[PDB]
Structures are given as structure tokens and as C-alpha cells.
Amino acid sequence: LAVATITQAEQQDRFLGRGELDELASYFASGAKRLEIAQLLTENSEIIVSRAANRIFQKIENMAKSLRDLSWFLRYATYAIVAGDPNIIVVNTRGLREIIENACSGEATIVALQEIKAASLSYFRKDPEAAEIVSQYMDVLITEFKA
Amino acid sequence: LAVATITQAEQQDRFLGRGELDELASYFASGAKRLEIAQLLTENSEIIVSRAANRIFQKIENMAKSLRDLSWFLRYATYAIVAGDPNIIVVNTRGLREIIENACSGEATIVALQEIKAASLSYFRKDPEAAEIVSQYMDVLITEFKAPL
Ligand SMILES: *[C@H](C)[C@H]1/C(=C/c2[nH]c(/C=C3N=C(/C=C4\NC(=O)C(CC)=C4C)C(C)=C\3CCC(=O)O)c(CCC(=O)O)c2C)NC(=O)[C@@H]1C
Ligand SMILES: CCC1=C(C)/C(=C/C2=NC(=C\c3[nH]c(/C=C4\NC(=O)[C@H](C)[C@H]4CC)c(C)c3CCC(=O)O)/C(CCC(=O)O)=C2C)NC1=O
């Protein structure tokens, strides 16, 4: 949020401070990378979601929907990574476990999500920097779902 | 802005296209470059305002306010550069010309504003692309102050 830093400093009749400028400088510097990551995760979304569903294959009853949802879970994660804002994951995963746990298995879902993390991480073996971003944003997705 | 792209992807329940992914790459590159310019103008604000002030001191009947306003102009410019939105300058310099011609001299203010532009630009000697940016935004600031009442 660049407009949000501005509206704060405006209120105090002041220039943006070093941290504020440094945080914004990084938000943009890391853009290229965050987008590289989202491109691979997308290009390989189907492979990734396959690995996750098979890992819990025998716990699934509606296959159409688990394949939908695992894909969605990955999609909102590519959103977050592109926006470099983990709150996107936080808002759409709100009260979602309560729904899934009625629908099928909450535990099965978490094991699947973990395999999504794994599968994603498998594409950044030569790039520890990117791996950390993928881990970070994935972890946020699993933790919000656990609640 | 990226939220803009993501939100209209979110409504089709789709991943981002490579087109959208590439238009986001440019946006980010521009943003980084703008923030490098804001850091410099902000780190060097005082130096930049003194030079502006010194260019017109003989005519100043209120040093504190003149310094303050000089600082306020540069301030809102970095606001605009950070956001990449020049309308921040249009909106906050509306009717500023009349207020200031009454308080002191509009002719003096313009000279001083020229010097802010000059001084700011002197931190980007080895960087034509950054200079173009600084210059566009400064020119907006000056233009909108020299608009009709
Ligand atoms: C004259 C050569 C110098 C000068 C003097 C000066 N200005 C004022 C009063 C005001 N100045 C402003 C300026 C701004 N307000 C803003 O929001 C911004 C950001 C873009 C600026 C630059 C305003 C709003 C006022 C009136 C409100 C107030 O008084 O605080 C005075 C006071 C005298 C008077 O009010 O009649 C003086 C002496 N300003 C210059 O820019 C010249 C360098
Ligand atoms: C983060 C983005 C996001 C997700 C994931 C999401 C899921 C989501 N899954 C749902 C249902 C469902 N979910 C599943 C099951 C599964 N789904 C899984 O992710 C598991 C792999 C598996 C069980 C563990 C089933 C079977 C239903 C249908 C429930 C029904 O028809 O009653 C519903 C109820 C509405 C609907 O039927 O579409 C939502 C909102 N919504 C979202 O906005």
C-alpha cells in the first residue's frame, strides 16, 4: 500500500521516513521475483494440484470439487505472492475450515495443502530466495486454515 | 493497481495471464525507480529548500513561513512521485497562487520553485531517465501554480 503510507504522512505534515521508503523500495524491487514465482506456480498449477489430490485420494468422495478447491487454494496464493501481501490469503480463508470440515475432511484438506506446498517448492530447487517466498506465503495459507 | 488486475482475475475465478503478469512487471520496475528518486529528494530535502530560499532571501518578510512553504511544495512533490500520481499536485496547489500573491510575491515564489527543480535535478547527473521524471513532476508543480485565478 503506497497510497496508505502517503495518507499517513500527509496527516502529520511530513516527508515519508526511511523505513517507509525502504519498505516501499523493497516491495517493488522484489516484484520481478514475486512474478517469476507466480508464473511457474501457474504454468504448473495442474501438475501441482494433481500431486495434492492423489496424496489424499482415498479420503475424497466428490473429486470434481476437491480438484476445484485445491486449484482455488493455489490460485489465491499466486494472488498473494503477486500482490506481495499475505492478507489476501487471510481474508478468503476466513471461516473456510468450518465449511470444508462439514463438506469432507478438514484433516485431509490440511495434508493436501501441505503437499501443495511441497509440490510448489519442488520448482525452486536452485533458488533459495524464491523458496523462502513460496514457503512464507504457503505457511500463511495453512496456518489461517488451521486457526 | 496490482489489486486492480488481481480483482478482475478474481471475479473470473482465473489465474493471472502472462500478459497481465508482464504489465505488472513494468509497473513494479517504474515503482522502484520512482522510490529511488523519492529517497534522494527526501534525504536531501533541507539542502534543496535552502538553495531555493537563498535564491530569493532579500525579498522575504517572513522567513519561517517561506521556508515552511518551500518545504511543503517539495514534500507534496515526493508524495506525487512515490504514488506515480501527478494529480496529487494539481489538487493541493489549486488556488494556492492567490493565497501566496497576497502573503508575499508570486514572482518570488516562481523563481524559488525553479530553484527547487534545479536543485532536485542536480542529484541525477548520471541518470537521464530519473531526471526526466523529476522534471515532468516539477513542471507540473510549477505549471499548476502558474495557472489562472
Ligand atoms: C513568499 C515569497 C513566500 C511565502 C510566504 C507565506 N505563505 C504564507 C501562507 C500560506 N502558505 C500556504 C502554502 C501551502 N499550503 C500548502 O498546503 C502547501 C502544499 C502544496 C503550500 C506551499 C498556505 C496554505 C498559506 C495560508 C495558510 C496558513 O497561513 O498557514 C504566509 C503567511 C502570510 C499570510 O497568511 O498572509 C507567508 C509569509 N510562501 C511561499 O511559497 C513563498 C516562498
Ligand atoms: C481459498 C479459496 C476458496 C476455497 C478453497 C473455497 C472452497 C469452498 N468449498 C466449498 C465446498 C466443498 N468442498 C468440498 C471438499 C473438498 N474441498 C477441498 O478443498 C478438499 C480437498 C475437499 C475435502 C477435504 C466439497 C465436497 C464441497 C461441496 C459441499 C457440498 O456440496 O455440500 C464451498 C461451498 C460453496 C461451494 O459449494 O462451492 C466453498 C466456498 N472457497 C474459496 O473461496
Side-chain angles (χ1 to χ4, degrees):
Chain A
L1 275 67
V3 60
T5 24
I6 282 162
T7 178
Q8 279 178 71
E10 175 151 6
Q11 255 288 111
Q12 314 207 297
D13 294 275
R14 67 171 172 86
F15 290 76
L16 312 191
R18 296 176 294 120
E20 276 172 336
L21 293 171
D22 179 76
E23 296 271 317
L24 284 176
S26 296
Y27 172 65
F28 293 119
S30 70
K33 187 59 54 184
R34 280 186 287 106
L35 289 171
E36 178 179 332
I37 291 174
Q39 162 51 55
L40 272 167
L41 285 194
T42 305
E43 219 174 42
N44 290 296
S45 52
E46 274 105 356
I47 291 165
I48 287 174
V49 174
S50 290
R51 290 178 56 173
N54 286 107
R55 180 70 177 71
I56 64 143
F57 196 98
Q58 41 279 316
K59 263 298 207 301
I60 294 176
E61 273 298 317
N62 178 346
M63 182 62 72
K65 231 84 168 216
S66 315
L67 280 180
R68 193 202 67 182
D69 287 14
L70 288 181
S71 189
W72 285 6
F73 271 133
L74 180 53
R75 181 166 50 95
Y76 277 91
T78 58
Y79 294 168
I81 294 173
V82 157
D85 171 31
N87 189 66
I88 282 174
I89 286 171
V90 160
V91 183
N92 298 271
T93 49
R94 282 208 226 272
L96 190 59
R97 181 179 90 268
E98 210 68 16
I99 289 193
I100 306 290
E101 216 145 38
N102 258 253
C104 53
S105 178
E107 284 73 53
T109 301
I110 294 176
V111 163
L113 285 172
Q114 280 155 0
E115 180 54 19
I116 287 187
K117 174 177 177 183
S120 303
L121 286 170
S122 100
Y123 296 82
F124 304 98
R125 169 181 77 81
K126 313 200 274 91
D127 192 353
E129 173 207 18
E132 266 292 352
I133 291 175
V134 174
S135 261
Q136 182 178 305
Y137 280 82
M138 292 305 302
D139 276 335
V140 163
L141 168 49
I142 297 176
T143 287
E144 283 309 325
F145 188 84
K146 272 170 176 179
Chain B
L1 323 181
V3 157
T5 291
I6 290 191
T7 282
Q8 193 118 21
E10 182 184 4
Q11 74 164 358
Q12 329 296 0
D13 294 356
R14 61 178 180 87
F15 286 81
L16 292 205
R18 224 165 156 166
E20 284 158 335
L21 278 185
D22 279 317
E23 306 153 358
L24 278 173
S26 295
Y27 181 84
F28 286 146
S30 317
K33 174 58 84 178
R34 291 195 273 103
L35 263 293
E36 174 177 344
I37 300 176
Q39 260 145 345
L40 268 175
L41 302 178
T42 294
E43 281 140 29
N44 272 328
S45 54
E46 310 238 348
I47 286 165
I48 295 184
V49 176
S50 289
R51 291 188 42 182
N54 184 44
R55 193 62 174 68
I56 60 150
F57 63 91
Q58 305 187 1
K59 326 142 204 203
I60 291 182
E61 296 180 37
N62 192 340
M63 184 71 65
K65 288 277 196 177
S66 299
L67 280 180
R68 149 183 172 287
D69 284 8
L70 288 181
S71 193
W72 282 11
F73 282 119
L74 180 48
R75 208 179 100 233
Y76 275 88
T78 67
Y79 285 176
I81 292 176
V82 166
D85 183 7
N87 199 65
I88 290 190
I89 290 179
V90 183
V91 172
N92 287 277
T93 62
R94 259 166 221 162
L96 214 42
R97 174 189 179 169
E98 67 161 348
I99 283 174
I100 286 187
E101 267 165 14
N102 155 5
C104 53
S105 160
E107 191 207 315
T109 290
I110 295 160
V111 174
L113 284 182
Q114 307 276 23
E115 184 52 32
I116 292 157
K117 180 180 150 139
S120 299
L121 284 166
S122 63
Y123 291 100
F124 309 88
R125 172 172 69 82
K126 315 184 271 199
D127 202 344
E129 309 132 310
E132 243 300 326
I133 300 192
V134 170
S135 193
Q136 142 189 352
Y137 276 88
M138 294 307 303
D139 271 345
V140 163
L141 197 183
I142 296 152
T143 292
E144 289 305 302
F145 183 90
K146 230 186 298 188
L149 309 125

